[PDB]
């Protein structure tokens, strides 16, 4: 139950409750992204519709955000009215019906929705199988319910106690008053929540290297490859990230995307190249493979990444803070490949 | 057109009062007995009339188990008034047989319809 | 071109094939899942399975035989695959394993195994698989309390009071000298198979098996097993059939075939030349029909077996069907009768001389059994030929012409009207 | 004297199934059944002492009514 | 253009024009599967309606089947008959209409049909997997089209072009008279079809080993592994296929299906284990790979796959006429894996 706040002399706070449970703590397929859905439902107190229709007129609205770590339930408001919007995320993390009614008529929907609109694009398609083929059982969960094993009710009920304990979440508001966030998390639910273990391993998350994985879908090609990198090495594919994205490279016309996910053990850094035909894919992808194993000069991007980095740093609540001042050089090592799409004219792992 | 949580309401008033429970409730036993809906092998709540949204709702919340009874119950009973006959003595619903089982349904949909509405027709304080 | 004879305690069927590689054989039963109770049902199914049994499979493969057997309603095959210059072999396993020494595959823990396995395996049936399990109710209410309704899968719950005193009294009822035919195709000759025969001493018992009481009579009904959550509507349909030996056999299949099957996927049955599909092609009433003409000692079915998606038009389908059935009566032209004669040849010509011998054995089996000799297929086809346009108005005038149907369906079939309503199609007014 | 039990494949229900069973059966079964008289008539199970009773005092074949 | 036959004294001939064909040889993915449902479409002189109810009215029917290196044009009938159904199936290799409202309205559903039978069981996509990574661009080729790259008409035609050819197939009839068949092959349009190359080559077919797949599906869990074998070892393949499917072998409760492949170039052996829950498939199949990396006596089998051999093979039109005498042990190497299914609670390669 750790309370920070960044006050400000603006109109607008937002409120954000972070728990370490997203489908990176998920037991089963899914169930992190299930009781995400299962969320801002009705609860023992207060039904689902009382709370948009009492929220919308005194100002504010809410969302639950599934990441691959966290549970983010963000709430935005006019500054004045705090304390509702405490009690409204104690009394969702304490109280939630969990409902099989709400299960077969809002989740359920709401998650063949969700997995649906993240089926039909090929570079979510990639980025899972690739956290899939590097991490196993870890980070590469599913991030999205499929239906694949059989999440009941009472498994999400099961992953909500688990989940939304004392000691694994975080309250973080920004615009907020600190000293009356704490006075407002206290006398509330947030204090009668269990006081159960963080789920936060401080341990190095077991990557895999050099496997390949191919899905077929019928649309746009993209091949990607992806590193597991470790605390020590964050800030430099941070600024290979930034690199490949900005105007440095000349390989930013064939990359489509290429970012780092940065976690508190470690991170992931994908990069994708799609195109609608193969043959695209296939030689801008073997030029990014040779052109990366053939060193890089990453020392002009790094006035660059400072930049970007304050710029995606500053929505955020928590900042880790990295270095960029020692990365000089990258060779690509090995590397994890997906491809998915018209498959049997991207390339494989041996001729990359 | 009686709302259910107003039937609640009266009859759990009329039950949880000393004497109104042992003055009106074996009126109640003998009104059930005569009313015979236990001869054709229903139970009272496959009898409410189901054609409104608020039954609609409470009969898609049902469970399965329970609505295929249900349905058995309804088409036994179909039948068994077609033949012009009554189920016989060991086919009757028995007493401790026949709980309301919809009715928690049917209550939580009118709780939710009667919010549903108050807050469709609220005035804030201003 | 098959040898037939009875030797001193049984008989010997042979059908020689010298351009095979390989040779059956077997013993064949004149007692299937017609002569069971009620209550001791799926017994022939727990003595199909326990000769198929691990513990004598295993002593069968290590001799380089392959065992297999087959349950059917009249009759009830053990049969050994082997080798042409291996049925020495075959025959001493078949006298060890299941006539001689027949208490070893009955013990306990190897009967507890199996009686679970096929426990799972008819569940597994009854769940999941709804043509065969309709065709299974379509027997049970045509067929209604006779000897000729009983599922040869056997219920789940006339499996579960099943015991080892069962099988026995199975066994020494109904594995009989007098009940068995011993069945030999493949290449091995009939002097070699009835020689191996009198060499090792080939006796099942001495008893007659039990009389059934009463034969089977067809009770025009329906079963109507529906189940909303099956995608499909599956529904079998038929009229009381010829049974085997009856002079109206071949015409019957005949007119089984003037209808055909139908596969609505495959592009070349979309093609065929049935009237039917000018009628259930244009909303695509069906997915796949088959017209068979099932035919058991005692009585038979004859009618056709479908499966929809279009739960909506159920009706549309049963009245086109009928209604072109009823032109078997009234309008059957002359090149509908040489289709299917055409197609009926090319069907029995299939059936009967596959490249299997064990499927052979079982046909050749029931087939004298039932009639104490094997109709050959030049015969057979001679007889498909005499068939005349007046000979299958006459016969659907006796048996389709407004007489009584047997329905079955599972699946949504809402859309299903009533009895009546259907068997007011059988007859229509002249029009 | 005899086995274990007449199993109940073959003698439960024996009052709705006497007539139907063919007359092989029928004596088998009675066979088994006076083999299993001479055993302390505690030890057998309730389908065979009804099966007994309806052999000798059914309402079949003698005992059968007029009308 | 080869001619054989089998005369036996009976009434139902079968001819078989088997062209070497397949989705081994497809240029595209699938372009064989639509060839083999455009196959008894309408020619160019009788109409594929005309076809069905002249030749039901003779007595015989047509099946055109797609193999892995096949395409068999088959044609069962009674005896009498063959100089119709050698000219029909002539006019099937050397004239098809090739209409595109025939490939928009009967071909087209009938490979969508296909594709969803074979889509709907698990056991077939995992052995389209395993061939696949065994083989990458030769024999694992799709063998049913997807549409994950678009097959056109002209595709379709110029796929004919290169397999119908006169070198290129091979005719064999059972249950017929060879010298009528060899003059009625004569005087037909296989002898006007061009002279083509055969497409068989006689190399090995340059397999990988150690690669690994791992299929998210819906409904029952496979785990398979897959061995490619070469042509002297394919012997003793086929009797620890035969093994392991018969009751000599422990492993046969444990084994949903285990099959050799042949070809005239090498083979797979395929093992696929298949149930409900995927703790099953998992405890099995790593009893599988346990028992069997410890050797296996495949002396008993020799008898027995001798007979099953012989069952398989007097189906067949071209027999490999094996060895079967020389085999004694067999000791698991190095083999592919798949996991089709719930595919987190299936093990993984370095697992088993
Ligand atoms: C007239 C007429 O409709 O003739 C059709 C009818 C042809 O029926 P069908 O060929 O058996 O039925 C094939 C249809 O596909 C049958 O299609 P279906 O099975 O969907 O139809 C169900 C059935 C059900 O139709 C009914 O019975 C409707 C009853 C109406 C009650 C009001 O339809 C009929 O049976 C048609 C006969 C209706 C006779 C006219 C009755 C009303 C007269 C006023 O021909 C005759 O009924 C001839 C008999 C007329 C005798 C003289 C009557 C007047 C005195
Ligand atoms: C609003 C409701 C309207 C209700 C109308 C009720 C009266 C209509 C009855 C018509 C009879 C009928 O409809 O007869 C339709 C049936 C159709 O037989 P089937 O298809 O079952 O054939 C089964 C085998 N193929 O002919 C018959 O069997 C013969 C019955 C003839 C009797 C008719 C008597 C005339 C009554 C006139 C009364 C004044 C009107």
């Known amino acids: 139950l750790t309370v920070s706040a960044r006050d400000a002399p603006t109109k607008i706070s937002t409120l954000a409750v972070k728990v370490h449970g997203g489908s990176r703590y998920a037991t089963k397929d899914g169930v992190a992204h299930l009781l995400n859905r299962f969320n801002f439902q009705n609860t023992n107190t207060r039904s689902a519709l009382k709370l948009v229709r009492e929220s919308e007129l005194l100002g504010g609205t809410f969302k639950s955000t599934l990441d691959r770590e966290y549970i983010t339930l963000k709430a935005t408001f006019l500054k004045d009215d705090l304390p509702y919007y405490v009690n409204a995320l104690a009394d969702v993390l304490y109280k939630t019906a969990f409902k099989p009614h709400e299960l077969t008529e809002s989740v359920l929907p709401a998650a063949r929705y969700d997995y649906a609109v993240a089926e039909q694009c090929p570079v979510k398609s990639a980025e899972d199988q690739l956290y899939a083929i590097t991490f196993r059982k870890g980070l590469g969960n599913p991030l999205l319910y499929d239906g694949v094993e059989r999440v009941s009710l009472q498994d999400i009920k099961d992953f909500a106690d688990k989940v939304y304990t004392k000691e694994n979440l975080e309250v973080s508001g920004e615009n907020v008053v600190e000293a009356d966030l704490k006075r407002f998390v206290d006398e509330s639910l947030l204090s009668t929540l269990p006081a159960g273990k963080s789920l936060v391993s401080k341990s190095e998350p077991k990557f895999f290297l050099g496997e390949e994985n191919r899905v077929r879908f019928i649309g746009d090609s993209v091949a990607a490859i992806g590193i597991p990198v470790n605390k020590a090495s964050l800030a430099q594919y941070e600024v290979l990230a930034n690199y490949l994205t900005s105007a440095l490279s000349e390989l930013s016309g064939l990359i489509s995307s290429a970012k780092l996910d940065k976690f508190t053990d470690g991170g992931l850094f994908t990069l994708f190249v799609r195109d609608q035909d193969s043959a695209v894919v296939s030689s801008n992808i073997k030029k990014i493979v040779a052109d990366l194993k053939k060193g890089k000069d990453l020392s002009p991007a790094i006035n660059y990444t400072k930049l970007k980095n304050a710029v995606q740093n500053e929505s955020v609540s928590s900042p880790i803070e990295l270095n960029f001042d020692a990365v000089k050089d990258f060779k690509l090592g090995k590397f994890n490949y997906v491809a998915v799409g018209d498959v049997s004219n991207l390339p494989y792992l041996d001729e990359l | ?126 | ?431 | 004297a005899q086995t274990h039990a007449l199993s109940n494949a073959a003698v439960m229900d024996l009052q709705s199934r006497w007539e139907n069973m063919p007359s092989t059966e029928q004596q088998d079964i009675v066979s088994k059944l006076s083999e299993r008289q001479k055993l302390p008539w505690a030890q057998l199970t309730e389908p065979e002492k009804q099966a007994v009773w309806y052999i000798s005092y059914g309402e079949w074949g003698p005992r059968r009514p007029v009308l």
Chains 1, 5 share one sequence.
């Not at chain 3, 049984?10 to 059956?24: D, F, G, Q, R």
């Not at chain 3, 015991?163 to 069945?183: I, K, M, Y």
Request: hydrophobic share 40%.
């Open chain 2, 1 to 126: 057109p009686q709302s259910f949580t107003s039937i609640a309401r009266i009859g759990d008033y009329i039950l949880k009062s000393p004497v109104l429970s042992k003055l009106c409730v074996p009126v109640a036993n003998q009104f059930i007995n005569l009313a015979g809906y236990k001869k054709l092998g229903l139970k009272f709540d496959d009898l409410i009339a189901e054609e409104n949204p608020i039954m609609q709702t409470a009969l898609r919340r049902l469970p399965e188990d329970e609505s295929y009874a249900r349905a058995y119950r309804i088409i036994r009973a179909h039948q068994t008034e077609l033949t012009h006959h009554l189920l016989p003595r060991n086919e009757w619903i028995k007493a401790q047989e026949d709980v309301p089982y919809l009715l928690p349904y049917i209550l939580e949909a009118e709780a939710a319809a009667k919010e549903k509405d108050e807050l469709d027709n609220i005035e804030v304080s201003k």
């Open chain 3, 1 to 431: 071109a098959e040898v037939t004879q009875l030797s001193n305690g049984i008989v010997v069927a042979t059908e020689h094939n010298p351009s095979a590689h390989t040779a059956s054989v077997g013993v064949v039963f004149g007692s299937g899942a017609a002569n069971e109770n009620p209550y001791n049902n799926g017994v022939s199914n727990l003595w199909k399975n326990i000769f198929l049994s691990k513990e004598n499979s295993a002593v069968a493969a290590k001799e380089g035989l392959a065992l297999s057997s087959n349950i059917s309603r009249d009759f009830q095959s053990y049969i050994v695959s082997s080798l042409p210059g291996s049925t020495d072999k075959s025959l001493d396993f078949l006298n060890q394993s299941f006539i001689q020494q027949k208490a070893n595959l009955l013990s306990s823990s190897n009967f507890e195994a199996t009686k679970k396995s096929v426990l799972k395996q008819v569940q597994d049936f009854e769940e999941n698989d709804h043509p065969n399990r309709v065709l299974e109710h379509l027997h049970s209410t045509a067929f209604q309390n006779t000897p000729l309704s009983l599922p040869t899968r056997g219920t789940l719950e006339s499996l579960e009071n099943l015991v080892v005193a069962d099988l026995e009294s199975f066994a020494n009822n109904h594995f009989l000298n007098s009940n068995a035919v011993v069945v030999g195709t493949g290449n091995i000759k009939h002097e070699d198979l009835v020689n191996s025969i009198e060499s090792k001493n080939l006796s099942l018992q001495t008893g007659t098996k039990p009389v059934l009481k009463k034969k089977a009579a067809f009770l025009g009904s329906e079963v109507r097993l529906r189940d909303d959550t099956l995608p499909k509507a599956w529904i079998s349909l038929a009229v009381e059939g010829e049974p085997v030996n009856s002079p109206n056999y071949f015409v019957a299949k005949l007119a089984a075939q003037i209808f055909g099957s139908y596969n609505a996927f495959e592009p070349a049955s979309r093609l065929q030349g049935i009237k039917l599909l000018d009628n259930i092609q244009e909303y695509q009433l069906c997915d796949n029909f088959n017209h068979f003409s099932l035919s058991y000692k005692d009585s038979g079915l004859w009618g056709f077996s479908t499966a929809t998606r279009n739960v909506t038009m159920i009706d549309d389908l049963i009245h086109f069907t009928l209604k072109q059935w009823n032109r078997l009566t009234i309008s059957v032209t002359d090149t509908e009768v040489e289709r299917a004669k055409s197609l009926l040849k090319l069907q029995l010509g299939q059936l009967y001389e596959s490249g299997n011998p064990v499927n052979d054995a079982n046909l050749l089996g029931a087939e004298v059994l039932i009639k104490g000799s094997k109709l050959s297929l030049g015969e057979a086809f001679k007889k498909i030929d005499a068939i005349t346009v007046k000979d299958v108005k006459a016969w659907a005038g006796k048996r389709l012409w407004d007489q009584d149907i047997a329905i079955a369906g599972t699946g949504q079939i809402e859309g299903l009207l009533d009895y009546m309503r259907i068997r007011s199609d059988m007859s229509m007014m002249r029009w």
